[PDB]
Design a protein around this ligand. Structure first.
Ligand SMILES: [Ca+2]
Ligand SMILES: [Ca+2]
Ligand SMILES: [Ca+2]
Ligand SMILES: [Ca+2]
Ligand SMILES: [Ca+2]
Ligand SMILES: [Ca+2]
Lengths: 316, 315, 317, 321
């Protein structure tokens, strides 16, 4: 009775969001449309902002498929949280990192000091390093701190290829790996067009070419640029990527997503959170999927890894 | 072969959006999250704003439940459109006169595209502009629809649900009249699940009309409280528009407080105003009339008269 | 390590179905179509039948929109279960029906309780209200955490048939059947709404509706199973969706309103029996019963429903 | 007025299911849970059954997340139908030859199809009845319709089972296993081992980089797909839940214009070096039915077995045309 209330509270899915701007709120609105989590709690530096955001999302619930309980809370709300999503943060690359780090050192401490023992999903930029921070601050197993990594980049890549191959993006199997940013790399060697092998379609002669494909990846790399170019900021893209990861985690999917994950030998690399294809479930990152990269992608991946470690080097 | 392509194109659902701000884009993201329509086309005065918005939205598609084809287009894309949603305009009587003029360019162009689907108008002052849209289009009145008081009903349901500790999906509650300060709650027809509100307010329960009075004021003035805090409102209506669109596209025969044209119901006529109405693939099937309490009947009649006075110098 | 792996198993939803016939496997199918549980365990005396259903049902999973893990298991798997749904039972005097299944049910519940189960029971086996009471006694569990499907489907049939009559979709018909699930149950005519509109005002204002039609509507709801079973050998699609819907109210902590078998504590002037009534369901089970003021005709009939129920249950307890 | 009302009837999706047994009604049940069509019509020779299945399925509608209009109807109702799903058929009674199985259902199909075309139907046929590839060909002949708009369920369920069992084996959710069964639905069908992915990973590379995994287990996994129906069938009588979801998924690709990839029975025109038969192959489906066949470079072992599959299919079809 005393126990059953406490168990009911724990048996449902609570997501706490920390950082309630457009990326935070785009993701929340995704959660409400799809009714993923029973409780969804908003925490911001700006009280009013988070209060107003929770009001506006709350009014969407009665026209949704099913209820979510959406409210403005605080670090306190994280105790029985299954998942903590952090977009929160502030704007040389080192100044960005070293600032976000101390900011993240406070955020994480308070969440740990709440009795939180769930999963972290880190969406703040630079995502790969801040996931590493969150891990190195939380004291949690490395499989339990996750970054959005190159998921959105992979989605952008699938959309674009689907267009180029005139096929639904849901049937395009395509991945980008490495650090999220200008050093990420398309895994051409493992692109599938439905059942079809990219390299075979390239073999055949038949209007496809690596030149059209290179253009596609640059269009991925610089997507944010174009949107920023054209509406001021970007959020709809990541909102849905953060949702897909959350489903993977909360609904224990064993699904493959290119999250920020900690390498322990795979791809010949280690000691980094980096974008790689990984199986996700209720426990977090179950395993990183290794593939034989082409010698070219190998140089590209290894280069991404070493630049990342160089970015961390003076900050940690 | 020639025909089958043409008919396949027609067999699916195309939604054109005209007006691509937060309100428009929140609705678009709801359609994408929920994969309602196969084609969703964005048009705005800003080529680049519509282009960026379709880019950002399109990259959500590969992680959505099912595909939608999302692109930036033009009034041209309105020809095979099943539903045109309009949130557009430019920022009581002053605003009304220009919004109306601009709506005459918008509507004509869409008509001149060969469009013969349904209109959903979401631009404030919603009730007047739905009337405008109708008067310009030449379409039957049941095929031009406004968002009306759907969002105020949902807010009302959300708050009552809190008050009664019950999911809002089980609160049956409506606000009718003109969307704005003149709207009114239909207390006489509020159900708390199975429970008649009045029978709860007669019992020995901890409820009282004064708590409820404060709830409607909190409903009426909700968007003030939200703007005050985050700078605007768009999530609320985004889903309200989603709801109307499903009712229409999926032929639901479902009841929603849209803006519909009165031809006698509630003792009133010759306005589009918020009322409970059955929607389906054909638009507004019928307005549902209820015996309002004497006070509810007095407030509805007032809302109507104010509306007509607002429209008088414009029409 | 182990402590995270065990918390993982708690941090997902698991349903275990006892009885894998027509009814439970239909429920299973909705549960797979709708991706409601991460885990779905089929239990049955006919151990081969459970293996085959789990095989056949699992095969639908890759083409479902989201995955569920589905396997034939045992009562042991109830340890971390959030909900047990029981459908096992012996077909149709009423008194013999009751003894045969109370015996069965007592063994079922005891076995479940042994594994360490500390979740919610949902009962569907006819006689539903009686068997819900039986389960409550044997489990020792709080009354709230023990629920029957009650008249939820009668209620659904009622809304559908009313939907047809008034020409609006059934999701907008607000209407309830209450009482002992069977031929003593009743429609609460006094609290039927057609969208925003009240049934009583509709019958009285300027139009052509008559209670005569409406009374027939209830008889079709009451005889529906009979009407179905004569045409196609049993009724099961409707009941599956009923169970889907009760299951979602509990696991998704909805606080929604369903006419499930719920434990009376003086609501409607009656007490100390399980019977179909409007209840509010959440993750804790039944959060509260919703009492309404029944017309004197409805109160007479609910009274009768409760007295027959008590008289049916008494000689066997 | 009635030109809007008539256009409304076109602006919604209507499916008419022919045959209301275990298979068709499981499909119906999926269709109701997922709110995929506005209208759903049950048709059956045994008019009693269709009436009660319609009643039963209808009663689930109010508790579905969204509504569907469900009724027992007739061929006449195919006029504005978008899709006719045909599940009517006759069992292969043990002791009888396939040629009698094929023959019973060729004649029945011919008249069914003729009856349908009569009412004015101008939509797409989805066929599930055994023999699926052969009966899809029968429907194409009789309807006179374009090859694209006449589709069988093919190996789609086999592909689903393959993914499921491969999922269990690699410990990844099936939705992330990209794997395909092709050929004639039955005991000549084959897995395209050359084109199996486990998430990102290529099955060949997975085997080649150090491991326990051996093709030996995988070969066992494929045998269990081919055999699964009989494996399910003894433990519970008939198999239907899987095929119901398969029909749901193909319906969704067609009515929702997905351009998604599904191993349906599709009319070969030189792909895989074979032609002029309906057979299970990876195809792109949208609102126009089959948009195209996706040809892959099969292994030599795969190319041999697909040759055998088509050769046996062509030979079984012959004496009954
Ligand atoms: Ca939890
Ligand atoms: Ca869930
Ligand atoms: Ca259309
Ligand atoms: Ca659990
Ligand atoms: Ca149609
Ligand atoms: Ca649809």
């Amino acid at each position: 009775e005393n126990l059953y209330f406490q168990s009911m509270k724990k048996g449902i899915n609570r997501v706490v969001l920390v950082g309630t701007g457009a990326v935070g709120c785009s993701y929340a609105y995704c959660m409400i449309n799809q009714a993923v989590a029973e409780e969804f709690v908003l925490v911001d530096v700006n009280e009013a902002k988070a209060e107003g955001e929770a009001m506006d999302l709350s009014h969407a619930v009665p026209f949704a498929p099913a209820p979510t309980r959406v409210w403005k809370g605080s670090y306190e709300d994280c105790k029985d949280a299954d998942l903590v999503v952090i977009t929160a943060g502030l704007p040389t690359r080192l100044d960005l990192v070293e600032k976000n780090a101390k900011i993240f050192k406070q955020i994480v401490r308070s969440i740990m000091d709440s009795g939180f023992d769930g999963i972290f999903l880190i969406a703040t930029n630079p995502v790969d390093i801040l996931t590493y921070v969150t891990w190195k601050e939380s004291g949690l197993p490395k499989e339990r701190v996750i970054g959005s990594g190159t998921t959105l980049d992979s989605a952008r890549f699938r959309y674009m290829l689907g267009e180029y191959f005139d096929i639904g993006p849901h049937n395009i199997h395509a991945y980008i790996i490495g650090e999220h940013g200008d050093t990420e790399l398309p895994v051409w060697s493992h692109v599938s067009v439905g059942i079809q092998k990219l390299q075979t379609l390239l073999e055949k002669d038949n209007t496809y070419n690596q030149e059209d494909l290179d253009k596609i990846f640059i269009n991925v790399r610089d997507a944010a640029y174009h949107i920023i170019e054209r509406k001021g900021a970007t959020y709809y893209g990541i909102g849905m990527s953060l949702l897909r990861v959350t489903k993977a985690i909360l609904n224990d999917e064993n699904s493959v997503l290119t999250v920020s994950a900690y390498l322990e030998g795979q791809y010949g690399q280690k000691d980094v959170y980096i974008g790689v294809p990984a199986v996700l479930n209720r426990g977090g990152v179950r395993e990183i999927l290794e593939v034989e990269l082409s010698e070219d992608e190998e140089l590209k991946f290894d280069h991404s890894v070493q630049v990342l470690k160089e970015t961390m080097a003076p900050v940690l």
